[PDB]
Structure 1
């Protein structure tokens, strides 16, 4: 699976990617939307607070039946949740990209999460035995995640 975009300067960027990750797309799509654009150090702090339910992930698009929370004030979204599994998966990719940046020799304190995209992946099927002799589909929703860190500079 290729990357959605290429960095402007390959010498000052780092990349990490995960394919067919066993994590819900709709949860990880909203989590990756929250950390887009902030600094790597800030993003790691934000993702860690989400795990222990101290900062919200606003479910802006997929908000059907999602309950309201007190931390969703100011985000123009009345709904949010604390996806632990999806936050953990991104935390492992953010760490992996950072080690790639360090090998390149970049300055970790200057890196930001410039590009982060989530794509749908192939589903896996399972049986759900319903009434009157029926069987349904019990399908997973995996996803691919791509992460690109670039240094922030004045323009």
Structure 2
């Protein structure tokens, strides 16, 4: 599966990717939106606090039936959750993208999560047995996750 975007300078970027990951797309789509643009060190700390329910992931688009929380103040979103499984899956991709950067020879402290994208994947079907002799579907919602870490520098064009 190809990447949504290519780095501006491949010499100063690192990539990680996962395909058909067995994690919910709607939860991971909100976790990736939270960590997009922050430094790699901060993004690793934020995802660890989501795990122990100390920073919230604001559910901005998929907020149907989600409850309100005290950590959702100032984010322009009244709803949030702490998706642990999607935080752990992104953490394994963030790590893999850092040893890829270390192998290249980039300063890890200067990296940032420039591009992270979540895509839908083919669902797996199961059986749920309903009343009056019916059978419904019990479908997973896997996803693809891309990740590009690029170094940061000041931009000036005269």
TM-score (norm 2): 0.98
Gaps of 5+ in 2: none
How far does the alpha carbon of each residue in 1:117-154 deviate from its partner, in whole angstroms, 9 at most, with x for none? 00000000000000000000000000000000000000
| Structural RMSD (CA) | 0.2
Gaps of 5+ in 1: none
How many angstroms does 1:109 deviate by?
Answer: 0.2
How many angstroms does 1:39 deviate by?
Answer: 0.0
Task: Give the aligned length.
Answer: 155
Aligned to 2:137: 137
How many angstroms does 1:92 deviate by?
Answer: 0.2
1:149 aligns with 2:149: yes
How many angstroms does 1:70 deviate by?
Answer: 0.2
2: distance between equivalents of 1:5 and 1:96? 19
How many angstroms does 1:71 deviate by?
Answer: 0.2
Which runs of structure 1 show a deviation greater than 4 angstroms over 4 or more consecutive aligned residues?
A: none
> Which SS does the other structure have where 2:44 is aligned?
helix
2: distance between equivalents of 1:49 and 1:55? 5
